[PDB]
Short mmCIF file of C-alpha atoms and ligand atoms in Angstrom, two decimals:
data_model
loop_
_atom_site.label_atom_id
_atom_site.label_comp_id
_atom_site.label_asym_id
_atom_site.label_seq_id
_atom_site.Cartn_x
_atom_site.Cartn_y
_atom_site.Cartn_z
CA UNK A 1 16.57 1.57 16.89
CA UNK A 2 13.25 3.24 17.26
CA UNK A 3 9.38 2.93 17.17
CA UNK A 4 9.47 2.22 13.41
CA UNK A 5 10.51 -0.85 11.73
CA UNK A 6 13.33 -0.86 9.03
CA UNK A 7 10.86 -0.18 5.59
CA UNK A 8 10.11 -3.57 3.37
CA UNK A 9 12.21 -4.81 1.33
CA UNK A 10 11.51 -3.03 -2.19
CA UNK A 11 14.14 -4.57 -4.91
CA UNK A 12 15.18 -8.37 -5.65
CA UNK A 13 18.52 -8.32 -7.08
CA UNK A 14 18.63 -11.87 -7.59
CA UNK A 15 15.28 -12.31 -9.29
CA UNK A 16 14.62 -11.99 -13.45
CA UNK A 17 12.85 -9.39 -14.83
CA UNK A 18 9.67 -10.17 -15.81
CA UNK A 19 6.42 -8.12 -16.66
CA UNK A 20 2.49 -10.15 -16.82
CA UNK A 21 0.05 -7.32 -18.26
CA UNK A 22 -1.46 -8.12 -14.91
CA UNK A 23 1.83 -6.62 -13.34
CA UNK A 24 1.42 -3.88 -15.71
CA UNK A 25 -2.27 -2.94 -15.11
CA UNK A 26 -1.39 -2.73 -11.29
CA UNK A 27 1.22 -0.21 -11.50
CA UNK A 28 -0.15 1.46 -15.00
CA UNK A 29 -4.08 1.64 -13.42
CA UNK A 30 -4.42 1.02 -10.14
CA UNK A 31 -0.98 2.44 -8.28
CA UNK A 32 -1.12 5.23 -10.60
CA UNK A 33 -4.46 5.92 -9.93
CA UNK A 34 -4.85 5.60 -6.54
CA UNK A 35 -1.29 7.52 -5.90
CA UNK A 36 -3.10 10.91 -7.69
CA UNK A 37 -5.95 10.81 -5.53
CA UNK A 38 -6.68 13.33 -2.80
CA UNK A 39 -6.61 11.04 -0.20
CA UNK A 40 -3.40 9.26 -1.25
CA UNK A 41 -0.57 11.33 0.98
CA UNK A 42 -1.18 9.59 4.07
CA UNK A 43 -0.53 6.12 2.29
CA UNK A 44 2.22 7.33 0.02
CA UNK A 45 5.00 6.10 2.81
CA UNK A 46 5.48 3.81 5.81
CA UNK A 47 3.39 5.31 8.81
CA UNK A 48 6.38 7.63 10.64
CA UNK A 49 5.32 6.14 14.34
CA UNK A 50 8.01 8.14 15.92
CA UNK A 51 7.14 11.65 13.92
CA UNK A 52 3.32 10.93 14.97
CA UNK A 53 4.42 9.51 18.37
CA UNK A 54 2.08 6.23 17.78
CA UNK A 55 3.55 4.20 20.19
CA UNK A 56 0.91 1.25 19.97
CA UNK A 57 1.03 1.36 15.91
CA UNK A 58 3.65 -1.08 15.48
CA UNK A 59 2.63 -3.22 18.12
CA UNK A 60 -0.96 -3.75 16.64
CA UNK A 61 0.30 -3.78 12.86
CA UNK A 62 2.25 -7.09 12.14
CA UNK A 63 3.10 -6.44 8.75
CA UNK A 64 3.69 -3.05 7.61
CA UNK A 65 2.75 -1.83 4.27
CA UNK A 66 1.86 1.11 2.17
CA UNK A 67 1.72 2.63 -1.53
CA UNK A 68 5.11 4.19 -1.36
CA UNK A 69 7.01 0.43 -1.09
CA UNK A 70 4.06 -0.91 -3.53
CA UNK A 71 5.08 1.73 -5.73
CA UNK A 72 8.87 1.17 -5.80
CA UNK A 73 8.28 -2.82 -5.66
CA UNK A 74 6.30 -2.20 -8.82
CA UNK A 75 8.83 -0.41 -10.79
CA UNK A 76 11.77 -2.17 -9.84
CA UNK A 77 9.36 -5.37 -10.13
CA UNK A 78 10.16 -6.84 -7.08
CA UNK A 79 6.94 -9.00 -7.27
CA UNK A 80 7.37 -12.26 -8.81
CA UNK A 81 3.06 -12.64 -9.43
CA UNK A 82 0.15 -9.94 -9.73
CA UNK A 83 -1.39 -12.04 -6.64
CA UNK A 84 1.79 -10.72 -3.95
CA UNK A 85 0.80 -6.86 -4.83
CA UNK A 86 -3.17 -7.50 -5.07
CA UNK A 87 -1.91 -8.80 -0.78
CA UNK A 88 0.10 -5.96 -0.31
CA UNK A 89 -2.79 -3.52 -1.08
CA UNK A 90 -5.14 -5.57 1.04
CA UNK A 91 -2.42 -5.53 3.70
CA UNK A 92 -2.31 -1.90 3.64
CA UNK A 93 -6.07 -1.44 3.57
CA UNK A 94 -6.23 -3.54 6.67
CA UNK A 95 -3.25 -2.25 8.76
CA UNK A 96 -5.65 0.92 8.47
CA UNK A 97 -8.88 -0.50 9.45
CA UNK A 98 -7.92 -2.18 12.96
CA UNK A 99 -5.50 0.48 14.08
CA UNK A 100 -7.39 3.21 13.50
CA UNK A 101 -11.15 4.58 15.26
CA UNK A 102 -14.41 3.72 12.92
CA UNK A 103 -15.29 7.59 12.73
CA UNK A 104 -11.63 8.91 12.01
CA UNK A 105 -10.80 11.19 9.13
CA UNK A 106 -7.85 8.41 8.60
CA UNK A 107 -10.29 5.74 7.89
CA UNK A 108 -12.55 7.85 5.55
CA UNK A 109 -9.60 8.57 3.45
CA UNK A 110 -9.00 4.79 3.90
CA UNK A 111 -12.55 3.71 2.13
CA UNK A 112 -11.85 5.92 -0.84
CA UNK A 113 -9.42 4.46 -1.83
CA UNK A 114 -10.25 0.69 -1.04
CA UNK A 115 -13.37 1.73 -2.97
CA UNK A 116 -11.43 2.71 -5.95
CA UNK A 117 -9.08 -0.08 -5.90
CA UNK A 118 -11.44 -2.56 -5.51
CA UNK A 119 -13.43 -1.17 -8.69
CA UNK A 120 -10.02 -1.53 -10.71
CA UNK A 121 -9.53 -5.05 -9.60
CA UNK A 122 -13.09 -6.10 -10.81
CA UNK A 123 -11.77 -4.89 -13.75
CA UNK A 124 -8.21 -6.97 -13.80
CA UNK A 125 -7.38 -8.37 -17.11
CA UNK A 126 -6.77 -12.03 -17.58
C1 LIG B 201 -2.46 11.47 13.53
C2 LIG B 201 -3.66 10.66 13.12
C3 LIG B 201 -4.92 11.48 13.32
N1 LIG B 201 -6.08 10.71 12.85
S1 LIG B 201 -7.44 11.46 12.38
C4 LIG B 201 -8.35 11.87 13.81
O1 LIG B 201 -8.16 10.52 11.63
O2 LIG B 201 -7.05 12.66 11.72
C5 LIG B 201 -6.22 9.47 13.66
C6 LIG B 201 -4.98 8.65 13.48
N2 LIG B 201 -3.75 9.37 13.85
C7 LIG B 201 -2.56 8.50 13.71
C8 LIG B 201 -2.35 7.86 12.40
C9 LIG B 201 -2.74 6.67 11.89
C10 LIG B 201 -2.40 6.69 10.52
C11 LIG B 201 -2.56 5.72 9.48
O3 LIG B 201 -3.15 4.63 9.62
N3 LIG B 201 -2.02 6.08 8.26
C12 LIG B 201 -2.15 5.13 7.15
C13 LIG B 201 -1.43 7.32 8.05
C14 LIG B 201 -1.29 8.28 9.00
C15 LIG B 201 -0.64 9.52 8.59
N4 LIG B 201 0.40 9.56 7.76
C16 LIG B 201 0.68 10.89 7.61
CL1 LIG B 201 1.95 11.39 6.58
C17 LIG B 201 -0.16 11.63 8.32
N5 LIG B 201 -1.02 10.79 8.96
C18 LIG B 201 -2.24 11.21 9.68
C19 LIG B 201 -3.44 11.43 8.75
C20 LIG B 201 -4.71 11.58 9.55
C21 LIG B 201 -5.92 11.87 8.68
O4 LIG B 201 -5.70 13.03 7.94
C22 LIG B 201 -4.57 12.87 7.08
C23 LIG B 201 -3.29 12.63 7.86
C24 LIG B 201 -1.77 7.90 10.26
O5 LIG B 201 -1.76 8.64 11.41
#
């Protein structure tokens, strides 16, 4: 082994398919949205705590998340409810927020996009 953690699980072989337009409005709005920002790339994969040499990361993080696994559990619809990806987001979101220092570049980059997601949630469809 190392530092980092095998990577969530991101497919359900044993699960049906099946979309909700809520499903769909998470990966067609907000994944898609927030994965084209400026400010996505550090998100877009599991934090590499051995490339970064973060020694403490996985120690403080208890659940590890970020949009790359959102991403593929979104299109191979791993999730069974909109509810499990809206906590996977706010997972992510925090994971950044107590790890990281208040000033940091990390958590600026952080903001924008809770800011952004949290705008496209207010706007979640029924
Ligand atoms: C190496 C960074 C340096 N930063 S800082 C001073 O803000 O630039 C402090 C954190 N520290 C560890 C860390 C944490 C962390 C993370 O939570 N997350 C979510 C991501 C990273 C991360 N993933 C990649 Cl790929 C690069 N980095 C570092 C960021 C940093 C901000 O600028 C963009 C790149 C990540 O790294």
């Amino acid at each position: 082994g190392s530092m980092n953690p095998p990577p969530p699980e991101t497919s359900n072989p044993n699960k049906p398919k099946r979309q909700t337009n809520q499903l769909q409005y998470l990966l067609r709005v907000v994944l898609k949205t927030l994965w084209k920002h400026q400010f996505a790339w550090p998100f877009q994969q599991p934090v590499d705590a051995v490339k970064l040499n973060l020694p403490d990361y996985y120690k403080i993080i208890k659940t590890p998340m970020d949009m790359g696994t959102i991403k593929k559990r979104l299109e191979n619809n791993y999730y069974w409810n909109a509810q499990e990806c809206i906590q996977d987001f706010n997972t992510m979101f925090t994971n950044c927020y107590i790890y990281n220092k208040p000033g940091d570049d990390i958590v600026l980059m952080a903001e924008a996009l809770e800011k952004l997601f949290l705008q496209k949630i207010n706007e979640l469809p029924t």
